[PDB]
């Protein structure tokens, strides 16, 4: 282990990325990592198996503009998905030709299908090309992050929500410099409010949603585009339908001024409501809140219908309903997995979506609502080469947390294995921000299952949004600790039930999921054989200061206030490193072999989090003693600055895991 300087007046200095001492600190930990990974002889064998299982063709869900359909395609191992078009159900843009692949993050086709606006990481910048001949327009727009490009129905330009060179809502006309873009909204009073936006399917209304923090609540402003004196060239006169942060609202459809909205107002599991803009105080349930299932999303389709995607004990259910009445017309349950990517719009009569699952790589279903609304027909099916899925099975069980609450978890494993404790086990989780963790497809997970005899578990802990807003709130702010408790209880069940045994269990997560993993190792290190935390939040007292971690106080709180500081100090990972051997009746326990993963250019979760936690752990556990009991290594894998890049990382983590758990190859 290398030398790390503890500033007693300890690792505040790592918060500066560019000093020598930090950049040499990196190199030493890079240097140490590779030395460790060199000992994990199964890295290469995993790496090749991942590549062989990922090598299958994948189609994105298609969408229609005018007479044309568009979709992403990948032949198997291309760096980045390629965007294609066709005349019925051709390359349009191939990012593998730029830098040998960054992918497209923005992609947006005009209503007439003439123009394709898209965005690349120039090191997000939006460009536009003509679909007829693939020639570029000159228009270049910078300072975009996650805003889409929303085309007006005149095909003359589009809305987008850039930051300054204080988020703004702007309109760009085709064939102008970005400096001529109309400013539609900003708020210097509330620099932290951020924006999402949308245009109604009929083209009459531009909708602007304002949000405060990552909380699921938003304002709703409506600009009627048909009542502008000289269109958007004026400058705006928003109708402020909702001007507070009390509930969430998302527009699903409108008939003239009569709008249908999804909301969580007085409805933690969500519902569809109806309001007339011309009479704004009268809201009426259209599809009431289910007291059982989360209404996750809704989409108007085939002129007069609706498709509701419900989440019901962490499985999807799709309902077809009448738009005007709200009446149930059909209900299609979905096997364990996830459907999503429903991009069909109100004047589309064929609906497409994607189904993936732990043992199912990707199916694009097509429901023609005109002709055969009953059955899902397969449009595309991906097949994992050399893999027979009927030797495996996934099942769901519910497990009691500390406080009594049920925690649903999925368990993927080989069929008919004896529950004898002898199987290596990987547990994933996230638990935060109302994010739903679905059991989707991962090729590396298959390698683990087949070539390591592994058992995999996905834990739907609190903090997520799986049982609605109550599930969320029961795992945020003062209640964050429950999330960690849920996860620990999940491992305990895997042990007691006899899938695996303490120290034969690995855990992995990213971002908040990184927090999750860091928190749990401190509190219960005797449980785990291996921990892997991908760019987590590890400094809970200071996270808010950097880049855009300020929009997570909604879910975490903040040290600034005292009541909150006291939740935080209790689980903040760097401030909770302790020698588990220095505790009574706990002496053969050490920390699991740990791998902290992070980039150099992640300006979401800044890497200081990861670095400071590494510094601390190596100190308290290893180098702070002369003959530390901590034998298990504590390293970082740092990604200097794409399919193959992403495969390398995972191959490493899995090789490390296999070493850590003494899992042999099969």
């Amino acid at each position: 282990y290398p030398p790390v300087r503890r500033d007693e007046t300890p690792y505040r200095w790592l918060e500066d990325p560019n000093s020598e001492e930090t950049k040499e600190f990196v190199d030493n930990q890079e240097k140490l990592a590779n030395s460790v990974l060199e000992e994990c002889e199964l890295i290469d064998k995993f790496k090749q198996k991942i590549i062989d299982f990922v090598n299958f063709p994948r189609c994105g869900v298609p969408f229609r503009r005018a007479n044309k359909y568009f979709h992403f395609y990948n032949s198997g191992l291309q760096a980045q998905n390629v965007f294609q078009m066709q005349d019925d159900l051709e390359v349009l843009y191939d990012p593998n030709l730029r830098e040998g692949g960054s992918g497209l993050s923005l992609y947006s086709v005009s209503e007439d299908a003439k123009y394709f606006a898209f965005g690349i990481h120039s090191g997000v910048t939006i460009k536009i090309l003509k679909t007829e001949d693939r020639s570029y327009l000159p228009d270049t727009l910078e300072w975009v992050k996650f805003s889409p490009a929303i085309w007006t129905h005149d095909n003359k330009g589009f809305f987008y929500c850039p930051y300054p060179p204080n988020q703004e809502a702007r309109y760009h006309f085709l064939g102008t410099d970005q400096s001529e873009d109309i400013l539609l909204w900003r708020d210097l009073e509330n620099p932290a409010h951020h924006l999402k936006c949308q245009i109604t399917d009929d083209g009459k209304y531009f909708l602007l949603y304002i949000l405060d923090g990552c909380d699921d609540a938003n304002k709703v402003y409506c600009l009627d585009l048909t009542k502008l004196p000289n269109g958007l060239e004026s400058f705006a006169p928003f109708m402020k339908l909702i001007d507070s942060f009390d509930a969430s609202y998302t527009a699903i459809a409108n008939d003239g001024s009569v709008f249908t909205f999804q909301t969580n107002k007085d409805a933690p599991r969500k519902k569809l409501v109806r309001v007339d803009l011309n009479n704004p105080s009268v809201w009426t349930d259209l599809v009431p809140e289910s007291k059982k299932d989360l209404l996750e999303s809704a989409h108007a389709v085939n002129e007069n219908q609706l498709i509701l995607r419900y989440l019901s004990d962490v499985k999807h259910v799709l309902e077809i309903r009448d738009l005007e009445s709200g009446a149930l017309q059909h209900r299609l349950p979905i096997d364990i997995g996830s459907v999503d990517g429903i991009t069909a719009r109100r004047r589309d009569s064929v609906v497409f979506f994607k189904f993936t699952s732990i043992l199912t790589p990707g199916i694009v279903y097509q429901c023609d609502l005109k002709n055969d609304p009953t059955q899902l027909k397969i449009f595309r099916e991906s097949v994992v080469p050399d893999f027979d899925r009927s030797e495996f099975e996934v099942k769901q069980v519910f497990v009691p947390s500390k406080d009594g609450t049920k925690i649903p978890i999925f368990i993927a494993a080989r069929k008919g294995i004896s529950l004898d404790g002898s199987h290596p086990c990987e547990m994933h989780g996230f638990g935060g921000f109302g994010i739903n963790m679905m059991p989707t497809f991962s090729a590396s997970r298959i390698v683990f299952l087949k070539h390591l005899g592994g058992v995999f578990c996905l834990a739907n802990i609190r903090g997520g949004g799986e049982y609605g807003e109550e599930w969320h709130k029961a795992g945020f702010r003062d209640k964050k600790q429950n999330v960690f408790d849920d996860f620990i209880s999940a491992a305990e069940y895997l042990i007691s039930s006899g899938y695996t045994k303490a120290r034969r269990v690995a855990i992995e997560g990213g971002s908040n999921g990184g927090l999750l993993v860091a928190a749990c190792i401190n509190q219960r290190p005797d449980l785990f054989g291996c921990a892997e935390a991908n760019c987590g939040v590890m400094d809970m007292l200071r996270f808010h200061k950097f880049t855009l971690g300020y929009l997570w106080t909604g879910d975490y709180g903040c040290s600034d206030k005292e009541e909150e500081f006291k939740w935080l100090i209790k689980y903040s990972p760097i401030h909770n490193v302790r020698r588990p051997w220095e505790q009574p009746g706990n002496e053969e326990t050490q920390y699991p072999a740990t791998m902290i993963l992070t980039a150099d250019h992640d300006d979401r979760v800044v890497p200081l989090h990861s670095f400071k936690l590494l510094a601390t752990m190596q100190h308290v556990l290893c180098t702070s003693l002369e003959d530390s009991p901590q034998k298990n290594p504590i390293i970082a894998r740092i990604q200097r600055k794409a399919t193959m890049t992403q495969i390398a990382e995972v191959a490493d983590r899995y090789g490390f895991m296999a070493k850590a758990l003494e899992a042999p190859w099969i």
């Binding site: 991942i50 291309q78 692949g101 992918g103 993050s105 993936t356 090729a443 399919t643 992403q646």
Partner: peptide, 6 residues
């Protein structure tokens, strides 16, 4: 738009 489900 992930390139691969790794």
């Amino acid at each position: 738009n992930a390139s691969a489900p790794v």
